[PDB]
Design a protein around this ligand. Structure first.
Ligand SMILES: CSCC[C@H](NC=O)C(=O)O
Ligand SMILES: [K+]
Ligand SMILES: [K+]
Ligand SMILES: [Mg+2]
Ligand SMILES: [Mg+2]
Ligand SMILES: [Mg+2]
Ligand SMILES: [Mg+2]
Ligand SMILES: [Mg+2]
Ligand SMILES: [Mg+2]
Ligand SMILES: [Mg+2]
Ligand SMILES: [Mg+2]
Ligand SMILES: [Mg+2]
Ligand SMILES: [Mg+2]
Ligand SMILES: [Mg+2]
Ligand SMILES: [Mg+2]
Ligand SMILES: [Mg+2]
Ligand SMILES: [Mg+2]
Ligand SMILES: [Mg+2]
Ligand SMILES: [Mg+2]
Ligand SMILES: [Mg+2]
Ligand SMILES: [Mg+2]
Ligand SMILES: [Mg+2]
Ligand SMILES: [Mg+2]
Ligand SMILES: [Mg+2]
Ligand SMILES: [Mg+2]
Ligand SMILES: [Mg+2]
Ligand SMILES: [Mg+2]
Ligand SMILES: [Mg+2]
Ligand SMILES: [Mg+2]
Ligand SMILES: [Mg+2]
Ligand SMILES: [Mg+2]
Ligand SMILES: [Mg+2]
Ligand SMILES: [Mg+2]
Ligand SMILES: [Mg+2]
Ligand SMILES: [Mg+2]
Ligand SMILES: [Mg+2]
Ligand SMILES: [Mg+2]
Ligand SMILES: [Mg+2]
Ligand SMILES: [Mg+2]
Ligand SMILES: [Mg+2]
Ligand SMILES: [Mg+2]
Ligand SMILES: [Mg+2]
Ligand SMILES: [Mg+2]
Ligand SMILES: [Mg+2]
Ligand SMILES: [Mg+2]
Ligand SMILES: [Mg+2]
Ligand SMILES: [Mg+2]
Ligand SMILES: [Mg+2]
Ligand SMILES: [Mg+2]
Ligand SMILES: [Mg+2]
Ligand SMILES: [Mg+2]
Ligand SMILES: [Mg+2]
Ligand SMILES: [Mg+2]
Ligand SMILES: [Mg+2]
Ligand SMILES: [Mg+2]
Ligand SMILES: [Mg+2]
Ligand SMILES: [Mg+2]
Ligand SMILES: [Mg+2]
Ligand SMILES: [Mg+2]
Ligand SMILES: [Mg+2]
Ligand SMILES: [Mg+2]
Ligand SMILES: [Mg+2]
Ligand SMILES: [Mg+2]
Ligand SMILES: [Mg+2]
Ligand SMILES: [Mg+2]
Ligand SMILES: [Mg+2]
Ligand SMILES: [Mg+2]
Ligand SMILES: [Mg+2]
Ligand SMILES: [Mg+2]
Ligand SMILES: [Mg+2]
Ligand SMILES: [Mg+2]
Ligand SMILES: [Mg+2]
Ligand SMILES: [Mg+2]
Ligand SMILES: [Mg+2]
Ligand SMILES: [Mg+2]
Ligand SMILES: [Mg+2]
Ligand SMILES: [Mg+2]
Ligand SMILES: [Mg+2]
Ligand SMILES: [Mg+2]
Ligand SMILES: [Mg+2]
Ligand SMILES: [Mg+2]
Ligand SMILES: [Mg+2]
Ligand SMILES: [Mg+2]
Ligand SMILES: [Mg+2]
Ligand SMILES: [Mg+2]
Ligand SMILES: [Mg+2]
Ligand SMILES: [Mg+2]
Ligand SMILES: [Mg+2]
Ligand SMILES: [Mg+2]
Ligand SMILES: [Mg+2]
Ligand SMILES: [Mg+2]
Ligand SMILES: [Mg+2]
Ligand SMILES: [Mg+2]
Ligand SMILES: [Mg+2]
Ligand SMILES: [Mg+2]
Ligand SMILES: [Mg+2]
Ligand SMILES: [Mg+2]
Ligand SMILES: [Mg+2]
Ligand SMILES: [Mg+2]
Ligand SMILES: [Mg+2]
Ligand SMILES: [Mg+2]
Ligand SMILES: [Mg+2]
Ligand SMILES: [Mg+2]
Ligand SMILES: [Mg+2]
Ligand SMILES: [Mg+2]
Ligand SMILES: [Mg+2]
Ligand SMILES: [Mg+2]
Ligand SMILES: [Mg+2]
Ligand SMILES: [Mg+2]
Ligand SMILES: [Mg+2]
Ligand SMILES: [Mg+2]
Ligand SMILES: [Mg+2]
Ligand SMILES: [Mg+2]
Ligand SMILES: [Mg+2]
Ligand SMILES: [Mg+2]
Ligand SMILES: [Mg+2]
Ligand SMILES: [Mg+2]
Ligand SMILES: [Mg+2]
Ligand SMILES: [Mg+2]
Ligand SMILES: [Mg+2]
Ligand SMILES: [Mg+2]
Ligand SMILES: [Mg+2]
Ligand SMILES: [Mg+2]
Ligand SMILES: [Mg+2]
Ligand SMILES: [Mg+2]
Ligand SMILES: [Mg+2]
Ligand SMILES: [Mg+2]
Ligand SMILES: [Mg+2]
Ligand SMILES: [Mg+2]
Ligand SMILES: [Mg+2]
Ligand SMILES: [Mg+2]
Ligand SMILES: [Mg+2]
Ligand SMILES: [Mg+2]
Ligand SMILES: [Mg+2]
Ligand SMILES: [Mg+2]
Ligand SMILES: [Mg+2]
Ligand SMILES: [Mg+2]
Ligand SMILES: [Mg+2]
Ligand SMILES: [Mg+2]
Ligand SMILES: [Mg+2]
Ligand SMILES: [Mg+2]
Ligand SMILES: [Mg+2]
Ligand SMILES: [Mg+2]
Ligand SMILES: [Mg+2]
Ligand SMILES: [Mg+2]
Ligand SMILES: [Mg+2]
Ligand SMILES: [Mg+2]
Ligand SMILES: [Mg+2]
Ligand SMILES: [Mg+2]
Ligand SMILES: [Mg+2]
Ligand SMILES: [Mg+2]
Ligand SMILES: [Mg+2]
Ligand SMILES: [Mg+2]
Ligand SMILES: [Mg+2]
Ligand SMILES: [Mg+2]
Ligand SMILES: [Mg+2]
Ligand SMILES: [Mg+2]
Ligand SMILES: [Mg+2]
Ligand SMILES: [Mg+2]
Ligand SMILES: [Mg+2]
Ligand SMILES: [Mg+2]
Ligand SMILES: [Mg+2]
Ligand SMILES: [Mg+2]
Ligand SMILES: [Mg+2]
Ligand SMILES: [Mg+2]
Ligand SMILES: [Mg+2]
Ligand SMILES: [Mg+2]
Ligand SMILES: [Mg+2]
Ligand SMILES: [Mg+2]
Ligand SMILES: [Mg+2]
Ligand SMILES: [Mg+2]
Ligand SMILES: [Mg+2]
Ligand SMILES: [Mg+2]
Ligand SMILES: [Mg+2]
Ligand SMILES: [Mg+2]
Ligand SMILES: [Mg+2]
Ligand SMILES: [Mg+2]
Ligand SMILES: [Mg+2]
Ligand SMILES: [Mg+2]
Ligand SMILES: [Mg+2]
Ligand SMILES: [Mg+2]
Ligand SMILES: [Mg+2]
Ligand SMILES: [Mg+2]
Ligand SMILES: [Mg+2]
Ligand SMILES: [Mg+2]
Ligand SMILES: [Mg+2]
Ligand SMILES: [Mg+2]
Ligand SMILES: [Mg+2]
Ligand SMILES: [Mg+2]
Ligand SMILES: [Mg+2]
Ligand SMILES: [Mg+2]
Ligand SMILES: [Mg+2]
Ligand SMILES: [Mg+2]
Ligand SMILES: [Mg+2]
Ligand SMILES: [Mg+2]
Ligand SMILES: [Mg+2]
Ligand SMILES: [Mg+2]
Ligand SMILES: [Mg+2]
Ligand SMILES: [Mg+2]
Ligand SMILES: [Mg+2]
Ligand SMILES: [Mg+2]
Ligand SMILES: [Mg+2]
Ligand SMILES: [Mg+2]
Ligand SMILES: [Mg+2]
Ligand SMILES: [Mg+2]
Ligand SMILES: [Mg+2]
Ligand SMILES: [Mg+2]
Ligand SMILES: [Mg+2]
Ligand SMILES: [Mg+2]
Ligand SMILES: [Mg+2]
Ligand SMILES: [Mg+2]
Ligand SMILES: [Mg+2]
Ligand SMILES: [Mg+2]
Ligand SMILES: [Mg+2]
Ligand SMILES: [Mg+2]
Ligand SMILES: [Mg+2]
Ligand SMILES: [Mg+2]
Ligand SMILES: [Mg+2]
Ligand SMILES: [Mg+2]
Ligand SMILES: [Mg+2]
Ligand SMILES: [Mg+2]
Ligand SMILES: [Mg+2]
Ligand SMILES: [Mg+2]
Ligand SMILES: [Mg+2]
Ligand SMILES: [Mg+2]
Ligand SMILES: [Mg+2]
Ligand SMILES: [Mg+2]
Ligand SMILES: [Mg+2]
Ligand SMILES: [Mg+2]
Ligand SMILES: [Mg+2]
Ligand SMILES: [Mg+2]
Ligand SMILES: [Mg+2]
Ligand SMILES: [Mg+2]
Ligand SMILES: [Mg+2]
Ligand SMILES: [Mg+2]
Ligand SMILES: [Mg+2]
Ligand SMILES: [Mg+2]
Ligand SMILES: [Mg+2]
Ligand SMILES: [Mg+2]
Ligand SMILES: [Mg+2]
Ligand SMILES: [Mg+2]
Ligand SMILES: [Mg+2]
Ligand SMILES: [Mg+2]
Ligand SMILES: [Mg+2]
Ligand SMILES: [Mg+2]
Ligand SMILES: [Mg+2]
Ligand SMILES: [Mg+2]
Ligand SMILES: [Mg+2]
Ligand SMILES: [Mg+2]
Ligand SMILES: [Mg+2]
Ligand SMILES: [Mg+2]
Lengths: 114, 208, 122, 119, 55
RNA sequence: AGGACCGAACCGACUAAUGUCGAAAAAUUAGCGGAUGACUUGUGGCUGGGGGUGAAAGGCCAAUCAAACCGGGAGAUAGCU
RNA sequence: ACACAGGUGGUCAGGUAGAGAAUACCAAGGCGCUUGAGAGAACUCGGGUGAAGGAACUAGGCAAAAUGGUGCCGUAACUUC
RNA sequence: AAUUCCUUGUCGGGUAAGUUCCGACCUGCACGAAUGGCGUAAUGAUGGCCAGGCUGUCUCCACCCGAGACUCAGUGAAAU
RNA sequence: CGAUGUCGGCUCAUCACAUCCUGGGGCUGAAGUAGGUCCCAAGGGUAUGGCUGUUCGCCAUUUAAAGUGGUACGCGAGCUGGGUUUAGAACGUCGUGAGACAGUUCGGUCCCUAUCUGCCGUGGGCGCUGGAGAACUGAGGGGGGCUGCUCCUAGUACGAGAGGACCGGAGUGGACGCAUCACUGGUGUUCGGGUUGUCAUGCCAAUGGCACUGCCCGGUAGCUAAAUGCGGAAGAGAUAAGUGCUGAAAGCAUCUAAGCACGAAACUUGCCCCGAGAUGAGUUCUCCCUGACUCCUUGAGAGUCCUGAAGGAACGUUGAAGACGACGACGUUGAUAGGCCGGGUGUGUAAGCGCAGCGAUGCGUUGAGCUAACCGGUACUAAUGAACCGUGAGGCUUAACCU
C-alpha cells in the first residue's frame, strides 16, 4: 500500500551500486567491539539477490580459512557501509546455489568483459 | 483510553545504531466521539467512538440517526472505551493519534486470522502418532479422549478438533516506535492480530 | 542447530577429528545448541598424537553451524560445516593451542575470550 | 485454507484442467458463444481474454505464443484477423456470462459465455 | 456404530424438521416480453433485461 | 556343460500399506523368489472315504476334512439349556 | 450369485529408442472404464518437496530414502580351487 | 549354547552408557557322537548383532498435488 | 462364561496429596554455605538416551525437579502387537508313547459407516410481550499461573581461615503458550527456465502432448517454523502453618476467652477470552408504523377493504470469512470479482532477423522476452428495475408525579 510504500522509500538509501549474481563483491560492514566502531571487509562471490525494495538482500559466499562462509546482507541496512564490485561473472542464472557443492577449480566462474 | 485503527501490513525500521526493528504499521484515522456514557444514565463512565467513512445508502437509518445526534459523519463501525476517572471527553470530538505520543507500550487487540476448522495437531499442538511402524489410519488423530468406566464420559474443555482463529485476541505491551501525525500512523514493534486491512483496537499498556 | 547425535568437526587442534554431541546443556527438554553454546561431546574419531583419545566424554562450544547466526539487522551468517572447540569438563577453557577457521561475534562473552584471541577471524 | 488464492481446481488434475480450457477457449473463439457450467465459464475468462489481447499486436512472436496456447492455427487465424482488430478500442472485458438455469442430468448451474459483439 | 435401541417416529420427525426445502418466492418479469424467470438468469425464450442476446 | 548367473513372459507368494457390511468368501498396489528345470502348462485318463493322495502341513480330496458330500437307520440319544 | 479391479489355452507380433516380447512414446485398430456437478475444512487414502540435524524412531531402520547402465582399471579374508 | 534354572554367571571386546551381540572361562540345574558330535567354502525373501551410505523413521512437523470426506441433484443399502 | 479383549509401548489425559522442584514456616547435633527433620501448601512444573517385550531396574549424561498413587494395574468401536495365550518347527527335560513343561527358541489375520449419552465446534426454531438496527453492563464460566543461571547488593554480614550469604534490584536463558510473515527459511504440479526419450503441428526453425510436475533448476502470493514479537507479573483483599501485641480465667505467667496486627506459587481479585436462553431473558442510543369498516359468546376475539414503514431475507458479485449454515464487503448515486492498464516480483538475455564458425555453437538487437494468487489504477464485462417477508402506535392491575 501507499502508506507502507511511503515509509519504505524514505528509509532506502538512494545510492546502491548495481551488481548481478556471479559478481565478486567486497561488502564493508560496521562492527562494534563494545566501544569501538570498525569497518570489516567481506570479499566474496554474490550467490543470490533478493529484490524487494527496502527488504532487498543478497548472499555473498567466501571460501575463507579452509571452510566456506555464506553471509546474507540486508542491502538497505545502515550496517552495510559500501558495496564495491571487483569482478563481473558471465553466469546465466539468478541463484548460484550449485557453487555450494563445488570447490576450487570447479567453483570458479568465467568473467563477462562485454 | 484507546483508538480504533486499520492494520496496514508490516515493515522494519532501521536505526543507525545497527538494528532493524520489525514494525506493524497501524493507520489511525480521526477517531470521532459519537456518544458519552455516564454513571447517571448507564451506570459506568465510557465513550463510544467511530472512524473511517461509510456510503450514504449503505448506512441504515438507525445508525444514520445515531450519527446525526452527534453531528459527525458516519464512520465504518462503532467501538466503545471506558474512562479512567481523570480524563473526560465531549461529543463530536475527533481524537487524533497524538494520544500515544507520550506513552511507550500498547496492548493491540484484534480479531485473529481465521484458520477455519482445525485438527488437534494444528489447534492444540497434539503430537502426531508414528508415521509408520504399523500405524493404521491414525497418524494425526487425537488418540484417547478419556479414561474408561469411572467417568464414563469425556470431560468438559477437552481439547478437540474445531474452529481455530477468527477470534478476538490481545497482544500485550508492544513497544511504540514512531507516531506520525502527518500521515496518521502508529508504528508498533512486533506482529499484531488479524490481516492487512483488519480493524485493530490500540490502547495503552495495562502492566506498566 | 546442533542436537544429540549431531556430529561436529573440530575447530581447534586438541586431537579430535570428529566428535558427537551427546547432550545440549543448560535446561530441561532443551532442543538445540548453536552460536556459542556449551554441549557435551563424545569423541568418535581422534588423531594419534593428540591430547585427547577416542571415546572421551568432555564439553565443547559450538563455534560454527550450517543453520547459522542472525545478527540484529536481520542479516544471517551461515557456514559449510557444524564445528566446535573442546573444553575441560569442570575447569572449562579450550584444550587446543590454536583454532582453525573463523568464529562468530556472538562467541564474545568473557569466558571464551581465549577462543577469540587464538582465532584468525571475527 | 486457500487465503488469497486463485484458480478453481474443478475436480481435475492440472494437466487435464489446462487441456479442457485449451479446448474450451478454442470452442469459444470458433462459435463465439458457448453453453458451459457457471464456474467453468467464470474460469474460462482468465484463459480466453488474454488470447484476445495477445491478438491485438499482429506480428510473429504473438502468433507463435497464441499457437503455443490453444494449439490450433484456425483459432490463431480467427484471432489476429478478426477478434484482434474487432476489440481494438475496447479495453478488457471481451467476454460475457449469462446464467441459463440448470443442467437436466445433474442439476449443474449452466451459463452461456460469449464474445461481446456477435454482429 | 449401531443403535442400542430403535429411535421413534418422534425423533425421526424432529430430525426431518430442517429437511423442508424453501420455494423461490422471487420470480422476475422481463421488461419487453413480460415472462417470468429467475433473477440474473435468462428466460426460456431467450431474453435478459429486455434484450434478446441469444438465438 | 550347468537342479550356473542377471532378467521379461510364465510359475510362485517374503515385506509393507490398502481393503475387512471389500472391487474380491483371500484381491489390489509397490517392492519380492524361481525363471532349461526336482520347471511350467493345455487336453484326456487313473486312485474314493478309515479310503485315496501327500518332497509330511493332520495338508489336500468341488469355498466343507483328526475322517468328504447326498439319501437312509432317524423323531439316534441330551440326568443339559 | 452381480455389466464382479480375480481366473482362463493357442495364434498374430508395425515404428523411434533399446540387448530385449523390459520400459518410454507411438502406427494399424481399439477404447475414456454407465452417477454427475460444485467446493477446496478436519481426517483418511496414493503421491511430491522439505531448514539444521541424521536412526536420536521402534521390538526391529518396519516404511521411505538411497544404489542402479555400458566400457576399461582395480579388487580382501577364506576356500571344496 | 535354538540346550544355563539360579542369571543381566564372571572376565574381555564393541558403545558416552550394551539383560541383545561377538570372544573366553566351565560351577553341563538338565551337551555329546548317525533320534549323529564337531568343523565348514558356497548358498538363504533364514534368526541375532555391528558399521558406511542414505533418509520425514524421528527431533517436529510444514506445504503442496490428486482420490474421498463436505454441499447440490439422481439412485439408494447394512449390522442392530 | 447366549464373550466385561487382560503385559508393555504410543496418543491423549484427569484427579488425590502421603510434596520431587518451586513458595511459606518451627527445632537443630542451624556460624555462613550446604543440609537434617517436622508443619503448611496441589498454582504451575516435573529429562533424553544405552540394554531388555518389559513395567521396573542398572547404567550414561542432564535437570530447579526428573514426585508417589487413583482413574477396568485410565486409555485396542483411539494406534501398535514386541510380551503372554491357537494351529508349524526345534533344543533341554519328563514320559514306553500320544504328548507335556510360569523352561527356552524361530514363525505366526487386531473387524465395526456413531442411534443415544458425552465431548469440540457450528447453525436453524421460538422466546425475552409493538417492531427494527446498534452499543454495552457482566451474573456466571473458561484460559493463564513454570523455573534457570549470570551480574549488582558484596567478596558485604558470617568466619583464624577456606568458603560465603538473607532481604533488594538487574540482565539474559530453557521449557510452555498466544499472535504473526517484516526478516531468515520450507513449501510453491497455477510463474520462468535447462534438459532426456518420443509423438505431433506439411517440413526447417519454433513450439505443444506423454513419460511420478518426465527429470531437474530457481521462485510469486498464500500457508507456515526452525523464523520473530509478546505473555507468566507487580499490586489488592481474606488467610494456612507460623510469628506477635495487648490481655482476664489463675495478685504471676499466658498469642485468646473479649479485642489488635503480620503471615505463602494455595483462596477471592488483578491479566486474557467467552458470556443476557442471566426465562432473574438486563441496560442505554437511535430508528419506524398515528387507516377505514363488519361480525359476534361486550373476546388479549373471527373478519372485510385498504395500506407495507424502519428493517430483513432472497438474488447476484464475492472475501486474509467458511465443511454447509454462519460471518464481512459489495450491487451502477458502483472498485465487489474478472478483464485491462502501469508498476512490481520472479525467471535470466525470447522469437525473428543479421553477423562470426567448416558445424555444434557463440555474439549483436537485449537484462530481453514471458510473468499465478501481489501493489496502484481502470466501469471494459458481470453485479436489475423489481417482486418477497416484516405492519397500521403496542395488554392488564397498581403506584409516583404532568395541567
Ligand atoms: C485358543 S487359546 C485362548 C487363550 C485365552 N484367550 C482369551 O481368553 C487366554 O486366556
Ligand atoms: K433307532
Ligand atoms: K535472440
Ligand atoms: Mg431513561
Ligand atoms: Mg460499511
Ligand atoms: Mg479464512
Ligand atoms: Mg491440519
Ligand atoms: Mg499435546
Ligand atoms: Mg511422534
Ligand atoms: Mg498391521
Ligand atoms: Mg483400526
Ligand atoms: Mg488393518
Ligand atoms: Mg494422514
Ligand atoms: Mg453417571
Ligand atoms: Mg568405548
Ligand atoms: Mg483474491
Ligand atoms: Mg479452488
Ligand atoms: Mg470430473
Ligand atoms: Mg466429484
Ligand atoms: Mg474426480
Ligand atoms: Mg503430465
Ligand atoms: Mg493475469
Ligand atoms: Mg493489448
Ligand atoms: Mg441392549
Ligand atoms: Mg408432519
Ligand atoms: Mg437433515
Ligand atoms: Mg430489466
Ligand atoms: Mg540339467
Ligand atoms: Mg538357473
Ligand atoms: Mg550373480
Ligand atoms: Mg535378485
Ligand atoms: Mg496364464
Ligand atoms: Mg500373494
Ligand atoms: Mg497363492
Ligand atoms: Mg524388510
Ligand atoms: Mg502406501
Ligand atoms: Mg469395513
Ligand atoms: Mg471400501
Ligand atoms: Mg506384486
Ligand atoms: Mg528391491
Ligand atoms: Mg530382482
Ligand atoms: Mg538365484
Ligand atoms: Mg495350474
Ligand atoms: Mg485333468
Ligand atoms: Mg477316476
Ligand atoms: Mg468315513
Ligand atoms: Mg459311508
Ligand atoms: Mg474301503
Ligand atoms: Mg488300504
Ligand atoms: Mg508333494
Ligand atoms: Mg501337529
Ligand atoms: Mg476344501
Ligand atoms: Mg484344516
Ligand atoms: Mg468321524
Ligand atoms: Mg468316525
Ligand atoms: Mg464332495
Ligand atoms: Mg422307521
Ligand atoms: Mg432330536
Ligand atoms: Mg460397469
Ligand atoms: Mg470382469
Ligand atoms: Mg487381470
Ligand atoms: Mg539408451
Ligand atoms: Mg510394455
Ligand atoms: Mg463406473
Ligand atoms: Mg473442502
Ligand atoms: Mg486434498
Ligand atoms: Mg503415501
Ligand atoms: Mg499423506
Ligand atoms: Mg520427483
Ligand atoms: Mg521424497
Ligand atoms: Mg530433512
Ligand atoms: Mg531448495
Ligand atoms: Mg539439506
Ligand atoms: Mg549422515
Ligand atoms: Mg534406540
Ligand atoms: Mg526410545
Ligand atoms: Mg532393542
Ligand atoms: Mg530383534
Ligand atoms: Mg540401515
Ligand atoms: Mg525396508
Ligand atoms: Mg515419505
Ligand atoms: Mg533424497
Ligand atoms: Mg524408492
Ligand atoms: Mg541421496
Ligand atoms: Mg538420486
Ligand atoms: Mg543415482
Ligand atoms: Mg558401475
Ligand atoms: Mg576384508
Ligand atoms: Mg567363517
Ligand atoms: Mg545368561
Ligand atoms: Mg535366563
Ligand atoms: Mg563384561
Ligand atoms: Mg569396553
Ligand atoms: Mg545402536
Ligand atoms: Mg560386557
Ligand atoms: Mg534382541
Ligand atoms: Mg539393538
Ligand atoms: Mg558367545
Ligand atoms: Mg556333564
Ligand atoms: Mg550329561
Ligand atoms: Mg536327567
Ligand atoms: Mg541331543
Ligand atoms: Mg542325551
Ligand atoms: Mg533313531
Ligand atoms: Mg543315537
Ligand atoms: Mg544334524
Ligand atoms: Mg556347532
Ligand atoms: Mg560353529
Ligand atoms: Mg561363514
Ligand atoms: Mg530357497
Ligand atoms: Mg529362505
Ligand atoms: Mg537375514
Ligand atoms: Mg540388529
Ligand atoms: Mg547404519
Ligand atoms: Mg506443529
Ligand atoms: Mg490437500
Ligand atoms: Mg444426495
Ligand atoms: Mg432391514
Ligand atoms: Mg449368558
Ligand atoms: Mg449379551
Ligand atoms: Mg468390548
Ligand atoms: Mg496394557
Ligand atoms: Mg518407546
Ligand atoms: Mg507415552
Ligand atoms: Mg490440566
Ligand atoms: Mg492433580
Ligand atoms: Mg513423613
Ligand atoms: Mg520435601
Ligand atoms: Mg531443595
Ligand atoms: Mg525461587
Ligand atoms: Mg521456601
Ligand atoms: Mg522469596
Ligand atoms: Mg523451606
Ligand atoms: Mg539456619
Ligand atoms: Mg511448625
Ligand atoms: Mg500437606
Ligand atoms: Mg490443579
Ligand atoms: Mg484447587
Ligand atoms: Mg491464584
Ligand atoms: Mg493446568
Ligand atoms: Mg514425574
Ligand atoms: Mg523419565
Ligand atoms: Mg546412574
Ligand atoms: Mg507411580
Ligand atoms: Mg480390565
Ligand atoms: Mg488398582
Ligand atoms: Mg489396563
Ligand atoms: Mg501403580
Ligand atoms: Mg483397531
Ligand atoms: Mg489397553
Ligand atoms: Mg475403549
Ligand atoms: Mg479406528
Ligand atoms: Mg500379529
Ligand atoms: Mg509380528
Ligand atoms: Mg510375535
Ligand atoms: Mg514369542
Ligand atoms: Mg506345536
Ligand atoms: Mg503353558
Ligand atoms: Mg517363568
Ligand atoms: Mg528372545
Ligand atoms: Mg515371516
Ligand atoms: Mg498385519
Ligand atoms: Mg449423532
Ligand atoms: Mg450424540
Ligand atoms: Mg458438548
Ligand atoms: Mg418458551
Ligand atoms: Mg432481548
Ligand atoms: Mg422482564
Ligand atoms: Mg465474577
Ligand atoms: Mg448457564
Ligand atoms: Mg483455571
Ligand atoms: Mg525467573
Ligand atoms: Mg565484586
Ligand atoms: Mg562477590
Ligand atoms: Mg528473595
Ligand atoms: Mg499449562
Ligand atoms: Mg514459540
Ligand atoms: Mg504479507
Ligand atoms: Mg510478504
Ligand atoms: Mg520469501
Ligand atoms: Mg505449467
Ligand atoms: Mg515449467
Ligand atoms: Mg523426436
Ligand atoms: Mg509428421
Ligand atoms: Mg521429422
Ligand atoms: Mg525442429
Ligand atoms: Mg531455442
Ligand atoms: Mg518445446
Ligand atoms: Mg499424445
Ligand atoms: Mg499414450
Ligand atoms: Mg521420488
Ligand atoms: Mg526421483
Ligand atoms: Mg539434479
Ligand atoms: Mg526453493
Ligand atoms: Mg526461497
Ligand atoms: Mg509485569
Ligand atoms: Mg501476591
Ligand atoms: Mg497491603
Ligand atoms: Mg489479613
Ligand atoms: Mg481484618
Ligand atoms: Mg508456635
Ligand atoms: Mg497480663
Ligand atoms: Mg496458679
Ligand atoms: Mg488453677
Ligand atoms: Mg506476658
Ligand atoms: Mg510470645
Ligand atoms: Mg513465579
Ligand atoms: Mg458480548
Ligand atoms: Mg419466566
Ligand atoms: Mg431489554
Ligand atoms: Mg426499561
Ligand atoms: Mg427508555
Ligand atoms: Mg360457542
Ligand atoms: Mg412495495
Ligand atoms: Mg406489495
Ligand atoms: Mg418507502
Ligand atoms: Mg461463500
Ligand atoms: Mg468461497
Ligand atoms: Mg447466526
Ligand atoms: Mg442469523
Ligand atoms: Mg443472515
Ligand atoms: Mg451486514
Ligand atoms: Mg454490508
Ligand atoms: Mg443492491
Ligand atoms: Mg453500463
Ligand atoms: Mg473512481
Ligand atoms: Mg479486482
Ligand atoms: Mg484483477
Ligand atoms: Mg493483465
Ligand atoms: Mg512497459
Ligand atoms: Mg517496466
Ligand atoms: Mg506486468
Ligand atoms: Mg527483475
Ligand atoms: Mg542473445
Ligand atoms: Mg523458451
Ligand atoms: Mg555462418
Ligand atoms: Mg549486454
Ligand atoms: Mg548491449
Ligand atoms: Mg535493466
Ligand atoms: Mg524493455
Ligand atoms: Mg510482456
Ligand atoms: Mg503479463
Ligand atoms: Mg486493488
Ligand atoms: Mg463511463
Ligand atoms: Mg468514468
Ligand atoms: Mg461500451
Ligand atoms: Mg439495485
Ligand atoms: Mg391503538
Ligand atoms: Mg388510537
Ligand atoms: Mg409511546
Ligand atoms: Mg401502555
Amino acid at each position: 500500500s501507499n502508506i507502507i510504500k511511503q515509509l519504505e522509500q524514505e528509509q532506502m538509501k538512494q545510492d546502491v551500486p548495481s551488481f548481478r549474481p556471479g559478481d565478486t563483491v567486497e561488502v564493508k560492514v560496521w562492527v562494534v567491539e563494545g566501544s569501538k566502531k570498525r569497518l570489516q571487509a567481506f570479499e566474496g562471490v554474490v550467490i543470490a539477490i533478493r529484490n524487494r525494495g527496502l527488504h532487498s538482500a543478497f548472499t555473498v559466499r567466501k571460501i575463507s580459512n579452509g571452510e566456506g562462509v555464506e553471509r546474507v546482507f540486508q542491502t538497505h541496512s545502515p550496517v552495510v557501509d559500501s558495496i564495491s564490485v571487483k569482478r563481473r561473472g558471465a553466469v546465466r542464472k539468478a541463484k548460484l546455489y550449485y557453487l555450494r557443492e563445488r570447490t576450487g577449480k570447479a567453483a570458479r566462474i568465467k568473467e563477462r568483459l562485454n | 483510553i484507546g483508538l480504533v485503527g486499520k492494520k496496514v501490513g508490516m515493515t522494519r525500521i532501521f536505526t543507525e545504531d545497527g538494528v532493524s526493528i520489525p514494525v506493524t504499521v497501524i493507520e489511525v484515522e480521526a477517531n470521532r466521539v459519537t456518544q458519552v456514557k455516564d454513571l447517571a444514565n448507564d451506570g459506568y463512565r465510557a465513550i463510544q467512538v467511530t472512524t473511517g467513512a461509510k456510503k450514504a445508502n449503505r448506512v441504515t437509518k438507525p445508525e444514520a440517526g445515531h450519527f446525526a445526534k452527534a453531528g459527525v459523519e458516519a464512520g465504518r463501525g462503532l467501538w466503545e472505551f471506558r474512562l479512567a476517572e481523570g480524563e473526560e471527553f465531549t461529543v463530536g470530538q475527533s481524537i487524533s493519534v497524538e494520544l500515544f505520543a507520550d506513552v511507550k507500550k500498547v496492548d493491540v487487540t484484534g480479531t485473529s486470522k481465521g484458520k477455519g476448522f482445525a485438527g488437534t495437531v494444528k489447534r492444540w499442538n497434539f503430537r502426531t502418532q508414528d508415521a509408520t511402524h504399523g500405524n493404521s489410519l491414525s497418524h494425526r488423530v487425537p488418540g484417547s479422549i478419556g479414561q474408561n468406566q469411572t467417568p464414563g464420559k469425556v470431560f468438559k474443555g477437552k481439547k478437540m478438533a474445531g474452529q481455530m482463529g477468527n477470534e478476538r485476541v490481545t497482544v500485550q505491551s508492544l513497544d511504540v516506535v514512531r507516531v506520525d501525525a502527518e500521515r496518521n500512523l502508529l508504528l508498533v514493534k512486533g506482529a499484531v492480530p488479524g490481516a492487512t486491512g483488519s480493524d485493530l483496537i490500540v490502547k495503552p499498556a495495562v502492566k506498566a | 542447530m546442533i542436537q544429540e547425535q549431531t556430529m561436529l568437526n573440530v575447530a581447534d587442534n586438541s586431537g579430535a577429528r570428529r566428535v558427537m554431541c551427546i547432550k545440549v546443556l543448560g535446561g530441561s527438554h532443551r532442543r538445540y545448541a548453536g552460536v556459542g553454546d556449551i554441549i557435551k561431546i563424545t569423541i568418535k574419531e581422534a588423531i594419534p598424537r593428540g591430547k585427547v583419545k577416542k571415546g572421551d566424554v568432555l564439553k565443547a562450544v559450538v563455534v560454527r553451524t550450517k543453520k547459522g547466526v542472525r545478527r540484529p539487522d536481520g542479516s544471517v551468517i551461515r557456514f559449510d560445516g557444524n564445528a566446535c572447540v573442546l573444553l575441560n569438563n569442570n575447569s572449562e577453557q579450550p584444550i587446543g593451542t590454536r583454532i582453525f577457521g573463523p568464529v562468530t561475534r556472538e562467541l564474545r562473552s568473557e569466558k571464551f575470550m581465549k577462543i577469540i584471541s587464538l582465532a584468525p577471524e571475527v | 485454507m486457500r487465503h488469497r488464492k486463485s484458480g478453481r481446481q474443478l475436480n481435475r488434475n492440472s494437466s487435464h484442467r489446462q487441456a479442457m480450457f485449451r479446448n474450451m477457449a478454442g470452442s469459444l473463439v470458433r462459435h463465439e458463444i458457448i453453453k458451459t457450467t457457471l464456474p467453468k465459464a467464470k474460469e474460462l475468462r482468465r484463459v480466453v481474454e488474454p488470447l484476445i489481447t495477445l491478438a491485438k499486436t499482429d506480428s510473429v512472436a504473438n502468433r507463435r505464443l497464441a499457437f503455443a496456447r490453444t494449439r490450433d492455427n484456425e483459432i490463431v487465424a480467427k484471432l489476429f484477423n478478426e477478434l484482434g482488430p474487432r476489440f481494438a478500442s475496447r479495453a478488457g472485458g471481451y467476454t460475457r456470462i449469462l446464467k441459463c438455469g440448470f443442467r437436466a442430468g445433474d442439476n449443474a448451474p449452466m451459463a452461456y459465455i460469449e464474445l461481446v459483439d456477435r454482429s | 456404530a449401531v443403535q442400542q435401541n430403535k429411535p421413534t417416529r418422534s425423533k425421526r420427525g424432529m430430525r426431518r424438521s430442517h429437511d423442508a426445502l424453501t420455494a423461490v418466492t422471487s420470480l422476475s418479469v422481463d421488461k419487453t416480453s413480460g415472462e417470468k424467470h429467475l433473477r440474473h438468469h435468462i428466460t426460456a425464450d431467450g431474453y435478459y433485461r429486455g434484450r434478446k442476446v441469444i438465438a
